[PDB]
Amino acid sequence: VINTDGTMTQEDISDYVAANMKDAISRTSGVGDVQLFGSQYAMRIWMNPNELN
Amino acid sequence: PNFFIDRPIFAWVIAIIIMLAGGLAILKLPVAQYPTIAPPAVTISASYPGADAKTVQDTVTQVIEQNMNGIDNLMYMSSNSDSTGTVQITLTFESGTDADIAQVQVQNKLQLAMPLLPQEVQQQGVSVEKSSSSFLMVVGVINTDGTMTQEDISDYVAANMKDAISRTSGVGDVQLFGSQYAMRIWMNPNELNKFQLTPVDVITAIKAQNAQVAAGQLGGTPPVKGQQLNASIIAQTRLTSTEEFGKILLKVNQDGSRVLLRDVAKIELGGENYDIIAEFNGQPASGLGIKLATGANALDTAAAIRAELAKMEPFFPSGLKIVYPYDTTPFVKISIHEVVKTLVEAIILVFLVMYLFLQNFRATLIPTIAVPVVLLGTFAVLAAFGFSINTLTMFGMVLAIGLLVDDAIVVVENVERVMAEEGLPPKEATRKSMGQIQGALVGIAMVLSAVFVPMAFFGGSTGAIYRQFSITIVSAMALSVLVALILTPALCATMLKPIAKGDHGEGKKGFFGWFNRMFEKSTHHYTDSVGGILRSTGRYLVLYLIIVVGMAYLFVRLPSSFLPDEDQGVFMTMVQLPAGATQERTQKVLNEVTHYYLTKEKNNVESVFAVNGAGAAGRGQNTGIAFVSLKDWADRPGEENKVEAITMRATRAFSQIKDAMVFAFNLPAIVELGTATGFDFELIDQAGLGHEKLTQARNQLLAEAAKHPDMLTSVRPNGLEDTPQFKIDIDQEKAQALGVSINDINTTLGAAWGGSYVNDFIDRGRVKKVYVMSEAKYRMLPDDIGDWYVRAADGQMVPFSAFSSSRWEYGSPRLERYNGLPSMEILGQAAPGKSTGEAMELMEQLASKLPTGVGYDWTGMSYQERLSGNQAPSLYAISLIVVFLCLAALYESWSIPFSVMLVVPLGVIGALLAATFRGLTNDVYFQVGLLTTIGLSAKNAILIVEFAKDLMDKEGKGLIEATLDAVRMRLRPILMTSLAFILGVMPLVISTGAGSGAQNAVGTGVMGGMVTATVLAIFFVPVFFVVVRRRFSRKNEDIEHSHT
Amino acid sequence: TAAAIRAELAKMEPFFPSGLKIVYPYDTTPFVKISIHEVVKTLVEAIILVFLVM
């Protein structure tokens, strides 16, 4: 999956890829496992080590 | 083949082996209502005690559907998020798939997603069970003196029986009508504010105080020398009585005043849950509701399961009377009993015919030996082919009677003819005769399978019903044909009295002699006439085009159906109380109906079972349902004492004069789908616009279809809308200074108004649950938000009124999904002048004209029609070309089959007419009725042209000359089988009572088939054959030729 | 099997945003497809070859 002119980032695409499809390709009767190239959204909270100290 | 006609004892031996193998393989043959026809279903059900709707949709459901990936032959996945804490995910699998392999595959994909599940669920189990799509049986239990409550009876059920009913090798989930007991602790919120304790403290209290404990062993292993003891260390034991639970210590006061559980709360042995109230004729009852099996037969699931229940019945106490609301059983026994009746009738009838023509007793015995032997073993072809003897399969037998009766009659007859014309002794007369029709019978076998094997190749559930028939009737054919080759001829060279050349009876001895003269004079009229018609080519051709064209109009103007609807002696009526109504109001209605049926239908209704709490797909307070059992069919005479009229005036009474939706209805015959021409439209949310946009798109659509009465009918959504829900938004802050811990505050609101599963105890030697929910009056009006205080870290209580923001929004009591994503079910039917697919293209255009993120899909009955649709003609293309080249081989030509196959319009336009005459319809029983009709029409036609061509060639005679002769001698049989038959189907055609929908649908279609079939063919065929043939080179002549 | 994935895909294809286009890097399909059209070719050639010989 791609965006033509202006890029979206791996994870952007990836989210779409994983969020509406990887739900039915892996449930289809006739598929083993799917390996998604990228990764689906997760809540990313990145801790500040100075500001936490 | 012939080899047996001069071997009666070898013939007998094939016959006797077949009978014994048949009838004895009959004694252990399976019996059901219908065979398992439907695509196999699995349910995952789960309980999240006290949760909210969007909760069980968004915490359990959405967490499975990500990892419910990797089950084989899965077709589709539907889920219901009930606002009762129940989530139900039914996976419907590809038909004929391995059931159990599927179901188990499901549970080892339950555990990829299982650890990351909610813990209230994980602790309350989830059950995955291979299941029908409907209830197979319901056994009721009530208390005689009534001095028991729903919950009491229910307990008894759970104490002595319902452990193995879900273990019978054919049961998925059973919905227990009731609830097994639980230790019910009802918290009093005043008497709790009194002693400085809150719910949280009650929980940790009862958890810790109630358990088993990690023990050990005196003289434990490994001991040391001399040791002479090993004995069991017992420890604290979980509780047992009401005493042990009142005496539960929560905190000791400084004065020594212990604070016990009995003080703070009420303690009673109560129901594990109070969702459903089930009233059998109002008297309190608990029952068992069994969903049908992924593949089992009926009187035997019932023999093993009633083995269970009759194993628990001698040890039941008095005061307790077992009751019987609904099964699918006596129905079957009297039905098949009816079909045996009709088959038997058909023998005495044929022999009636056979005597009234052949007048030789010894000739009348012959075919009488035929049918028992062929049926008896016909069963053997089934039993070894793994099918079961239910309703429809037997209808394949009684329906096969035509081609069987024909078989024996055709043969024994021709013996009689040869001996009537040439004086030959039996044995030789037979050899020459079997020599006249042999190829004919292998041909009939061929073409018959040509019409019938393709029916087994139907796909789907429809495929299954058709298969039962293909196989039964094709088998009835096979054994009848082989009989007609070994015993049937060999009986003739052995049993028939020898006739000298040309006695033909005429007049000799009244009653009959007057008969035979009457016949002869007639039949020659018949021949003098048929030739008369042969002089006129054109006329009869035109008339033909007509007849077909008519058959075409007539076929078109008959609307389809799927199966006939039956007074099943049992039906159901549905209840829906306005949004937000309570158990009080719904139960008011159930009381109303229960009274109605048991009064103004005093003669017919015997029992109503009102189920309060679930009507539509899920459980819920606004919904009710009532099951009506009726008195024996025998005691409800007319039409008004039938399901038609009863349901009619019920719904009359309940539709137009009430505040709640009350519909009375009866399900189709089959415990599964096909409620005629309609659908189950799924509008699936795909972009992610949440519950609201979907609600409105569906409304837009539902109004958009009410605007086309020229395509749709009853466009209704099936389900529940969005009801009033009450947000208690917590201002976390005010509680974050105040020194109260949120965790406790939640768990308190919860165990208060939802409830909590905390521990397990041992009642009477059997485990049950431990539930601590608030008491009645302390959680029913919004005002109770206040009356509950949480004890903080310092030591003082806090009002919910200190941080509990409180508002009114909407939420649905049923959050549904279809195929892993959120969706909504608009259930429906096509308008009185519509095919369903018509509606399918138009719905596709309406749901097309909806916002970008509302997609569409088909399920259930309307799933079927996405697969192929216009192929039934294609299988008839196959059935056709194969029956034809089979004829091109028997007749070693191309034109001569045109001559025999042209008879099929004649058989049908008459079959169409009668079904059209009564009120009947283009279904299965008529379709199979048609094919079987197609068959005799084509059989008879075959004999006509084969005997004529034989004469033409191998007797060197002419076209006109021979066809007339053949037509002449083989006429008399046409009429015999025909007359023996028409009279056999006759009663079924009439019939009132049990399966009269079936009997009528088959019998009538078939009979109307039979009339026009003979009285048209015996005049048409020779015109086919001469006029088909009247296109070839040599003289012929008429009369030629000269040879041997 | 591709027909089943493409069933899924022909149903997820209407609800898409701009620039977002499907592409195909690893396809062991056209190899098989044109391979059979090819073994068929040779087969029929074998017949025409034969009939001519005769």
Ligand SMILES: CCCCCCCCCCCCO[C@@H]1O[C@H](CO)[C@@H](O[C@H]2O[C@H](CO)[C@H](O)[C@H](O)[C@H]2O)[C@@H](O)[C@H]1O
């Ligand atoms: C259930 C009860 C009702 C059942 C209905 C059955 C009716 C079926 C129609 C069969 C009619 C047979 O009628 C018979 O054949 C043909 C045409 O038919 C006619 O016969 C005549 O037709 C042609 C016309 O040139 C010739 O000249 C011939 O020599 C002459 O016999 C009739 O005078 C009669 O001999």
